[PDB]
């Protein structure tokens, strides 16, 4: 029965309103009063608690994982936190030790967020320093990069998911836009500022629609369009409804998660089946009770599957919700499962992720099917310690007569009237029972499965107080009265004592004589007479003759003996210095505590006293350490606790509040012979060592009732090996998920760790893995989903979709933009320009709408819009001439040389937009795209090539864009890879993947292409395949996995013979 040091959390504080985050690793972290707690959602149990901050935690943000993982960059957990004092700590949650400290000024940190662009460096952090300072930090060495100051009060900021160089700020005046964000130089100027026409609640971008963001209001939700700076969608609640509190967008599908003031969560999905954007409510949960002391703070959602939500409320309760599908605007099931379409006889898992529950986006009012209904279910619940002022007690110490059934139980009393039972080994709450109707004053144990507790009611105008005494047996939970029915007119009870052998019991009142009881018989034995000294302290003798001693208000020490019903007196002691408030007895030493702060070390062997003043204020309670020959006591004062020694008088360690520790001590106890338990005033219970020195709790040595699936807790050499084992499932004929069938010469401990990690997977995941018809692409997608990585998650979906499309409507979702088809993109652009045209307001918008329509191909509706300029505007002649020209220039065969010359001259002189517009207007978009690319506007050129142009001319433009994206001054290789995959050039993708030392993603891509028939093994393409196979085999050999290494070396051919010469 080993006990490890640990801490237990309770209620939350007002400063922890927005301290919670759900990262891609699958763990949820929230901020306690001064601690960070990491919990799991699948099993709902606490895993690791971090305690180093000296102030309240205000922000917790998980790290981003958008980079290739290898030996140099293995899978690790990284956390960042901020406090009120203005300190930022970078955490490595595997042992409890920090890696970086950042502090500037003495003001609270208002916003912390990582950078998603990790192509070059993955240790960049941006934080806001009040009042107008923004600093970009480094998470590796804590070195400042640049500092920029503004002339406003920045509240929050968000990053553009599509353009890394775009950043926006929310100020008390308006919104500030930055378009020159870079880690090398600070922003040039203040940027473009606009004024909204103060009480905004949230500002975030929309990851589903480009150039879209939302503004949160208590009664309204606004969708804003960037290129027109106009509202295109309003989400409003009914007249009698609950105001909004928070909103969280989604990426896989166009949806929003909304949190209300009453604790309700609603899901809204964009309408696509039967002018402004409309979001229809789909699912709703059940509201929780709202009280002046209990209120929800904020909610989080899973960023990987977007099918689970977590809610945090003030009292420490965590609720986990799940979204389920079953078979207003209708919704239909997806066509492709795990990246590829499936039939009607294969196993399916619609609840695996959100994208597998509903279909892709569509335009309402267009000609086109199983209905899908979504509902919310509560499957998790976590509870913590109640309000402060606990009352704790420890189980009887472990002797050699009860080793078989000993269990280290802990009893904690609260003001609600309930008693909490803990285990202290696994850390889980064992039992919770409601006993009393008022605050519990004391808890004492009578056996290993029973204890006693008492409570008092509110005194009246005279002083008489109702007394309650209940005996509780833990396995059954029964509660019965001990004294009986004594009425509600009696004096209160100060203290109760149970003898060492659990035989007798004493009850002490304010002005009532002492009473002696029997635990087994539950009958009275003897009641003291009226002429009895007042009781101020009492203690038994841990030595059926049992002895107990007590003192009076004067100071005289009285020693009495008990044997059955007869009670006699032993001896007397001369008075000795003020009034005694606590007595402790063990062995032959007796210790007395006084008001002034003096401890008299009386020893009943030589009649000698040793008074050692503590120079403190007042002594509350003292208790000795369990165990024979263990002469140690802990003394509780009004400012802290101290550990002493009764053999040699010398203080061992001290803990003073305000000088050494930041919190107070409300109760002390003895867990084991070498550990102590301290109760804090903030609602925390800590188990510390001899010196009460804070330790670093490590997740490696921790016993858990239920295994937790987390590859990040394993060694770097194990996660990659497990990934390789899972990817190539068909080992040596049969299918199995145990290590002991494949050749893998490593130590037994890591093998057992891998086996227990595998055994914690869900039944449906295991069944999907054990499917002969589950193709390699689906396996790769499932592995990417399980590991929580984003790079492969984005790569494999697009790769599989394009491979299946080219091998042979199911279109790609619009969340990829330039990675979609021409017609699907063109339809969305037409819808967007129609929305823009609907809500034109002034002359500064009609011109822009006409310009957009003149490049989207609409020629008939642009002439009519042009013929509307007023007769007083100075541009009437220009607009009329342009309209007439557009009407008469519909011929493209003859008389086009001079028009092209004029366009080229206008482009050369500086006017580029007009020249490009005219060139696209007459007969040519490729030349306009070339000129746009020459001047550095790559995004508009790519958009133009996607809208117009045949799929034979856009290929060259996109290849040039990819080549530009590969420049060392940009470092955007992932986007170039995605565009190359969209272009259907698999050989170039494989070559550039091999050039970037991606030894696994290239081999998997080659295998997938060979299976799907993209390129054959000819006399020219065999060298690259052989080199990739040899490199992957070497990489697998470097990890200790010999089976995959030899399997790939066999297929390598003539470049793997040397590797096989040393493998075997």
Curated annotation (Swiss-Prot):
Tissue: Ubiquitous.
Chief location category: cytoplasm
Effect annotated for changing residue 370 to Q: In HH14; reduces the interaction with EMX1; does not affect the subcellular location of the protein; decreases capacity to shuttle from cilium to nucleus; decreases GLI3 protein levels
Coiled coil: none
Subcellular location: Cytoplasm, Cytoskeleton, Cilium basal body; Cytoplasm; Nucleus; Cytoplasm, Cytoskeleton, Cilium axoneme
SMART domains: WD40
Ligase listed as a keyword: no
The WD repeat ranges on this chain: 52-101, 104-147, 292-327, 393-432, 488-527, 577-612, 614-654, 660-698, 760-807
GO biological process annotation, one example: heart development
GO CC, any one term: cilium
Keywords, alphabetical: Cell projection, Chromosomal rearrangement, Cytoplasm, Cytoplasmic vesicle, Cytoskeleton, Disease variant, Golgi apparatus, Hypogonadotropic hypogonadism, Intellectual disability, Kallmann syndrome, Nucleus, Phosphoprotein, Proto-oncogene, Repeat, WD repeat
Residue numbers carrying Phosphoserine: 329, 333
SUPFAM superfamilies recorded: WD40 repeat-like (SSF50978)
Pfam families: Beta-prop_WDR11_1st, Beta-prop_WDR11_2nd, TPR_WDR11
Tagged with keyword NAD: no
Noted disease: A chromosomal aberration involving WDR11 is found in a form of glioblastoma. Translocation t(10;19)(q26;q13.3) with ZNF320. A chromosomal aberration involving WDR11 is found in a form of Kallmann syndrome. Translocation 46,XY,t(10;12)(q26.12;q13.11).
Function summary: Involved in the Hedgehog (Hh) signaling pathway, is essential for normal ciliogenesis. Regulates the proteolytic processing of GLI3 and cooperates with the transcription factor EMX1 in the induction of downstream Hh pathway gene expression and gonadotropin-releasing hormone production. WDR11 complex facilitates the tethering of Adaptor protein-1 complex (AP-1)-derived vesicles. WDR11 complex acts together with TBC1D23 to facilitate the golgin-mediated capture of vesicles generated using AP-1.
PANTHER family hit by this protein: WD REPEAT-CONTAINING PROTEIN 11 (PTHR14593:SF5)
Subunit note: Component of the complex WDR11 composed of C17orf75, FAM91A1 and WDR11; FAM91A1 and WDR11 are required for proper location of the complex. Interacts (via the N-terminal and the central portion of the protein) with EMX1. Interacts with GLI3; the interaction associateS EMX1 with GLI3. Interacts with TBC1D23; this interaction may be indirect and recruits TBC1D23 to AP-1-derived vesicles.
Record protein name field: WD repeat-containing protein 11
Lineage: Eukaryota, Metazoa, Chordata, Craniata, Vertebrata
């Amino acid at each position: 029965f080993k006990v490890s040091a640990r801490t237990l959390t309770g209620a939350l504080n007002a400063h922890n309103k927005a301290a919670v985050d759900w990262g891609w690793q699958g763990l949820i972290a929230y901020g306690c009063h001064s601690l960070v707690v990491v919990i799991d959602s699948i099993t709902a149990q606490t895993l690791q608690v971090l305690e180093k901050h000296k102030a309240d935690v205000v922000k917790v943000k998980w790290a981003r994982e958008n980079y290739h993982h290898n030996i140099g960059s293995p899978y690790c957990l990284r956390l960042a936190s901020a406090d009120v004092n203005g300190k930022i700590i970078v955490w490595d949650v595997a042992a409890g030790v920090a890696q970086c400290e950042i502090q500037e000024h003495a003001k609270p940190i208002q916003d912390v967020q990582w950078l998603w662009n990790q192509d070059a460096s993955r240790d960049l952090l941006l934080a806001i320093h009040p009042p107008n300072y923004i600093v970009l930090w480094n998470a590796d060495t804590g070195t400042k990069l640049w500092k920029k100051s503004y002339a406003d009060n920045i509240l929050s900021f968000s990053f553009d998911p599509f353009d890394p160089s775009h950043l926006t700020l929310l100020t008390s005046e308006g919104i500030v836009f930055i378009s020159d964000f870079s880690p090398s130089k600070p922003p040039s100027g203040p940027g473009k500022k606009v004024y909204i026409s103060n009480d905004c609640l949230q500002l975030a971008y929309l990851p589903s629609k480009r150039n879209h963001m939302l503004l949160l209001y208590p009664r309204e939700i606004l969708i804003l369009d960037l290129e027109v700076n106009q509202t295109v969608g309003v989400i409003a609640i009914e007249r009698t409804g609950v105001p909004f509190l928070q909103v969280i967008p989604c990426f896989q599908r166009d949806g929003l998660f909304c949190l209300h003031e009453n604790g309700c969560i609603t899901l809204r999905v964009r309408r696509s089946y039967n002018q402004e954007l409309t979001y229809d409510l789909r699912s709703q949960c059940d509201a929780i009770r709202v009280t002046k002391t209990v209120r929800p703070f904020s909610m989080v959602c899973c960023p990987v599957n977007e099918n689970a939500a977590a809610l945090v409320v003030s009292d420490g309760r965590v609720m986990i919700w799940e979204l389920k599908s079953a078979v207003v605007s209708p919704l239909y099931s997806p066509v492709s499962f795990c990246g590829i379409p499936v039939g009607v006889l294969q196993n399916k898992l619609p609840d695996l992720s959100l994208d597998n529950m509903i279909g892709q986006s569509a335009i309402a009012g267009e000609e086109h099917l199983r209905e899908v209904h979504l509902k919310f279910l509560l499957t998790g619940l976590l509870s913590g310690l109640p309000a402060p002022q606990f009352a704790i007690r420890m189980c009887p110490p472990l002797t050699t007569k009860n080793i078989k059934m000993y269990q280290p139980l802990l009893a904690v009393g609260t003001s609600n009237g309930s008693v909490l039972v803990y285990h202290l080994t696994s850390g889980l709450l064992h039992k919770e029972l409601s006993i009393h109707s008022c605050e519990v004053k004391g808890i004492e144990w009578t056996s290993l499965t029973s204890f006693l507790s008492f409570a008092t009611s509110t005194p009246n105008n005279m002083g008489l107080v109702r007394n309650e005494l209940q005996l509780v047996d833990l396995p059954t939970g029964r509660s019965i009265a001990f004294r009986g029915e004594r009425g509600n007119d009696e004096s209160a009870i100060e203290m109760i004592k149970v003898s060492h052998l659990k035989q007798y019991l004493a009850v002490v009142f304010r002005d009532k004589p002492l009473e002696l009881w029997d635990v087994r018989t539950c009958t009275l034995l003897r009641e003291m007479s009226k002429n009895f000294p007042t009781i101020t302290a009492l203690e038994w003798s841990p030595s059926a003759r049992e002895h107990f001693v007590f003192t009076d208000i004067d100071g005289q020490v009285y020693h009495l003996t008990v044997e059955g019903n007869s009670v006699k007196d032993s001896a007397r002691i001369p008075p000795d210095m003020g009034s005694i408030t606590c007595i402790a007895w063990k062995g032959d030493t007796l210790v007395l505590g006084d008001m002034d702060g003096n401890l008299n070390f009386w020893d009943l062997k030589g009649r000698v006293s040793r008074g050692i003043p503590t120079h403190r204020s007042w002594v509350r309670k003292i208790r000795f350490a369990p165990g024979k020959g263990n002469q140690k006591l802990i003394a509780m004062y009004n400012d802290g606790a101290e550990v002493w020694d009764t053999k040699e008088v010398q203080m061992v360690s001290s803990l003073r509040s305000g000088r050494n520790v930041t919190f107070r001590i409300l109760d002390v106890d003895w867990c084991t012979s070498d550990k102590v338990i301290l109760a804090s005033d903030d609602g925390c219970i800590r188990v510390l060592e001899m010196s009460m020195k804070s330790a670093c709790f490590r997740m490696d040595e921790q016993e858990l009732t239920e295994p937790v699936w987390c590859p990040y807790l394993l060694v770097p050499r194990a996660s990659l090996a497990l990934k390789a084992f899972l990817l190539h499932q068909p080992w040596n004929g049969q299918y199995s998920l145990d290590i002991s069938h494949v050749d893998y010469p490593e130590n037994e401990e890591i093998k057992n760790l891998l086996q227990e990690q595998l055994n914690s997977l869900s039944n449906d995941i295991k069944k999907l893995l054990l499917d002969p018809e589950f193709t390699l692409l689906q396996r790769c997608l499932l592995v990417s989903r399980l590991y929580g990585d984003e790079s492969e998650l984005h790569f494999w979906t697009v790769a599989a979709h394009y491979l299946h499309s080219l091998s042979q409507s199911n279109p790609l979702d619009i969340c990829y933009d330039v990675l979609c088809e021409n017609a699907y993109f063109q339809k969305f652009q037409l819808e967007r320009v129609n929305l823009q045209e609907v809500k034109r307001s002034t002359y500064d918008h009609t011109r822009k709408c006409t310009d957009q329509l003149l490049l989207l191909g609409q020629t008939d509706r642009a002439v009519q819009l042009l013929l509307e300029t007023s007769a007083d505007n100075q541009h009437y002649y220009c607009d009329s001439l342009k309209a007439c020209l557009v009407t008469t220039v519909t011929s493209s065969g003859p008389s086009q040389s001079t028009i092209k010359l004029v366009a080229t001259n206008m482009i050369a002189n500086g006017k580029l937009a007009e020249g490009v517009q005219l060139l696209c207007l007459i007969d040519k978009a490729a030349d306009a795209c070339r000129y746009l690319q020459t001047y550095g506007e790559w995004n508009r050129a790519a958009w133009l090539a996607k809208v117009r142009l045949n799929p034979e001319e856009c290929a060259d433009v996109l290849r040039r864009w990819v080549d530009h994206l590969c420049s060392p001054q940009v470092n955007q290789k992932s986007k170039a890879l995605l565009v190359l995959l969209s272009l259907g050039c698999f050989f170039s993708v494989a070559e550039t993947l091999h050039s970037m030392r991606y030894f696994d993603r290239a081999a998997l891509f080659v295998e997938a292409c060979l299976k799907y028939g993209a390129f054959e093994v000819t006399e020219d393409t065999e060298k690259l395949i052989t080199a990739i196979y040899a490199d992957y085999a070497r990489s697998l050999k470097n990890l200790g996995f010999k089976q995959g290494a030899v399997l790939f070396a066999s297929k390598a051919g003539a470049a793997g013979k040397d590797l096989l010469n040393e493998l075997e």
